[model samples]
Target: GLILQSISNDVYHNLAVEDWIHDHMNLEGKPVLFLWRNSPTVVIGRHQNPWQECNLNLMREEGVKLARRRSGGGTVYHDMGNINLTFFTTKKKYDRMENLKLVVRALKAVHPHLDVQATKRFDLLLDGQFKISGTASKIGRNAAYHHCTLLCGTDGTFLSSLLKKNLMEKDPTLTCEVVINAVATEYATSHQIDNHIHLINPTDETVFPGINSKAIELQTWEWIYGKTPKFSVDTSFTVLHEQSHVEIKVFIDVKNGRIEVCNIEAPDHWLPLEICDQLNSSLIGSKFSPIETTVLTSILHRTYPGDDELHSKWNILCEKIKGIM
Candidate 1:
């Protein structure tokens, strides 16, 4: 195995390196080791719905970037101080248990007494309760990569696994440089991979030809939100009009992040079936976002030939609908 380190700490460009190697490299005789970290990012599973899996409003408010990785698993948060590792191997030699065991060994070097056990699920938990590493793998036709998150201090990469650092504070002696280089040390001395951790530049096109395209593809919104798995929002809420309250039911089915099916139910006298019908018809085929809903509501408002009361109700209904988003 050959150990390589990323000079940069970006999430997308670092992720781009994963695609860069899987599609380009020859892993026939060599197993590769990648060590890197990122700032703050929430990586979503390929088949998971972001709307349900995350609190996006708070995520955006806190400036946490979001990414949809090609791996199928639950979403996980990434920070700069964590150490992210990926073991690349050909399908002929792919073994999840063996790879995780190596990490357990790597951890044991630092704290030999640390009871980091690997369960059958391929998870490494410290002392049987707290987790140390989480798993996600991509098995290609020819090549494969197993990526991990280890809970590290400073907001970074793991073997990116989450660990609760015990009473270890104010001690800057042990750090990424120590643990990171320690892993390389053990892998070199014990497993005899490579003694040198080559610092790689991810954005260099010549070094990694056509790698920019992979990074650019990752930058697109289509891959981020558009690729989310199909899901629905079924909910109802009460809306007060004058002195009376009424229940409005909404059901939306979405595919490709666009509304494919939409239905709104409200008491006729409270909002009118004619208006709700128009809202339902208008919502279909639109983006599942409040901004899009806002535009459509204005367009519907201007279409009415007469009736200010009708326009008022339309606005309230539109706001009510958008509120769910």
Candidate 2:
């Protein structure tokens, strides 16, 4: 067994390490145990749509980073307080329950009084009610890895406020050391492998050659957002006009995170059909994002140059459209 820990806290770098290991490592005779933590970030699943998973605007306002993982699972929030453990092994030897059991043993070894159990879904629950860990996995042709999170001293208030969702350690360092030692011992004994905690820096080119490029790619908008699976938004909202309420309907089909087809319908009396049609036409072939929408509206405003009333209507319509994205 090869045990490693990351010195960096960047989410993209840590995720890049995972990708590098999965793609380059030869796990036939050697398995790996990777330990890492990240700064405040939200990691969505490979197949997940970020807009449906979390509030992107809030994340941006709070300066929280966002990343998309290659794993297949639900979205999760990560911070320095949360510990991530990844067990890499051959596809034929992959067993999620066994890996989880090892984590359970490790936790119990440190805190004998702690009440933790691995659920059928592979999540580790605290005191039978609160969830302390969540699981995610990825499988390649000949290799596989099971990764899970251990909540130690995570900010519960911040998580709740941002996620509307969802440890007890006062010292993050002390808790990390305890968990690391416990897992190291258990894994070493079970696999008849030498016990060693190898400290690795993800940014080291000599150790992990070509890793910086991988990390850079993960941070790109094309990979982070454009990789999202094809999806559509079909929703609408109400807009007030001259002390009266008006209903506006919107339907958008997004492919590769770009708007493929868009239709905005508003009462002709409230807004001219020609204007609405122009907005709809501008949306197609643009990214399904607030920044792209802003640019499109800016160009449309320039076309009408100095039409204050028309610009007000455009702003109102654009704001409503951006809300859904």
Candidate 3:
């Protein structure tokens, strides 16, 4: 009794459609699907600290914006070279493996030559070594949604540029500990199935014709960026042992999981309030990073007006804030 829909191929449009489904549709046991192609972009997870998962500076330099999806998982990279599919179903009807099997069936149909397999980790691999797709999903008390991206003919340079991680420069003496996963270089040798594969890029009409009266709403900024909720988090930390530990403060407003404003304050010695303010100012309306610390560092420099001294201080501040954010 559920409806199957293609929605659209436009990235923003599908995002908008997701909003409508999550906001107004009360089909608890029904199914809704969104299959689309996104211009080069990165999508982060709900409940994730985007600051720690992706390479924002590289993405920005490459003209890719950060997109936060209303789901759970790590960060993922997307482009027109890939296909994104979102399956919305009720909690009672949710089946992660079964839904993933649908993706496998689709791929098998497209590339009969590629030896593809899905792993226990939920990743889909080709020839048992190269990852062809990554999975992320959301399960709630009443409803759930599963979203995954399937790679087809993505540009190597653009993919590399957006997916690299920004790690701190190595220094033996300065060790606090932040673990960042390496980029997807392991899948570098993955074979391209473009020659062997075929896709079905149906419009809203071909996919969901005649039943729904809602207009296509995926290409608008209001749906992609505006649906973000305005919320802030306040947390205090104690620095430097018992002798006169400083109380550090942080405040941030996240819209659609991207930074709008981030404020930090401390008692001044070693930690810079201006640097914090500068960083906050830079991130206004910027997509949240799920990879590199450099994303935050770049914002700090932009806010503080980068100079050698500013850079060094900013690096130190980034080190400090990374522990806190």
Candidate 4:
């Protein structure tokens, strides 16, 4: 086993390095332990719904980047204090239990008094209660990597609410540098590999060779939002008209994060069905993202011209729909 760490803090760049190592590295007898940390990003699993798993509106407001990892699991919020580790091994050598136990050993080595244990599901819990680590892995034909996060501590004020609960707590002693080096040292003593931590720059093209494209691909909407599993939303909201209320119902089926079907219906006595149908058709084949909704609604504003009353109604309907993503 060998110890490696990323020099880049950008979430997209760090993710690309994982792609480069996973696709290009040969992990037969030589297992590799790679450590990386991102500034502030919400990383979701491959099959997880970004809308269901993450607060996209809040993330956008906080200027936090959202990434969809190739691995499968739930979502995670990464910050400066949190540490991410990826264990690369061959098909036959892939063992999550051992990898998680290794993490527990590293934590114990640092603080002997700290009570931490790995669960059967590969989670690292602290003090027999709080979850310290969230584990996920991607297995290829020959090469495989199990990437997990260790929350030494992070900004619970922001990401904790973003995930709707506390995934981690504050710890002043267990810093990223301290925790990572402890693990690297344990990895060296156990696996008898290089203890020296090699820092690799994710942005350097010469060393990585066409790695920028992987980062670019990861940054694309086609992968991030487009890769979400299919889901539908059946929601109804009432629009106020001079203290009187008229309800509008929305039925949407999304595939690849794109609206495959859209049915925004309003009674003819209230808002016109013709305009409602127009809005429905406009949303189809477009992403269920706020950015996309912003683009669509702006176009919608101009498309239905000359009627301020109709425009206001449309705006009300669109704003309600935007919250779904």
CA lDDT scores, all candidates in order:
0.74, 0.82, 0.54, 0.81
Backbone Cα, N, C clashes tallied per candidate: 23, 0, 9, 0
Look at candidate 2 and tell me the lDDT of residue 16: 87
Tens digit per residue, CA lDDT, model 1, 1-325: 6888898877889999987888878888777888888888788777877676556655667777778887667777777656788878797877777777776676667765667778887767666776656788898998888887766564333213322141022235446666677677765664575598988988988899878788878878778888877889888887676567777889999899888999889888876687677778777887776656455656656666667887777767777776655
Q: Clash number for model 4?
A: 0
TM-score of each: 0.84, 0.92, 0.52, 0.91
lDDT tens digits by residue: candidate 4, 1-325 = 6788997889889888887888887888988898998888898898887788677778778888889888888888898877999998887899988888898788878877577887877887666777778989999999889999988766756766776423224446677788898899988988887689999999998989898898999989999988877899898988776589888888999999899998888889777777777778777897787636556557657666667876666677767877675
Candidate 2 lDDT over residue span 150-228, tens digit each: 8876777777755521255433343766777888888887787778788989999798888999899988888889988
| Model 3 lDDT tens row, 155-198 | 54556654431101112221111110001111111222122112
Candidate 1 positional error at 95, Å: 2.1
Give the C-alpha miss distance for residue 179 in model 3, angstroms: 36
Highest lDDT scorer: 2
Off by over 4 Å in 1: 154-174, 240-244, 272-274, 292-320
- Scanning candidate 2 in windows of ten residues, the lowest lDDT window is 164-173
**Clashes in model 2: which pairs?**
none
Model 2 residue 321 CA deviation (Å) reads: 1.6
Residue 222 of candidate 3: its Cα lDDT? Answer: 46
For residue 130, what is the lDDT in candidate 4? 72
Write the candidate numbers in order of decreasing lDDT.
Answer: 2, 4, 1, 3
Clashing pairs in 3: 12-218, 13-218, 13-219, 50-289, 53-290, 53-291, 54-290, 54-291, 54-292
Please give the TM-score that candidate 3 achieves against the real structure: 0.52
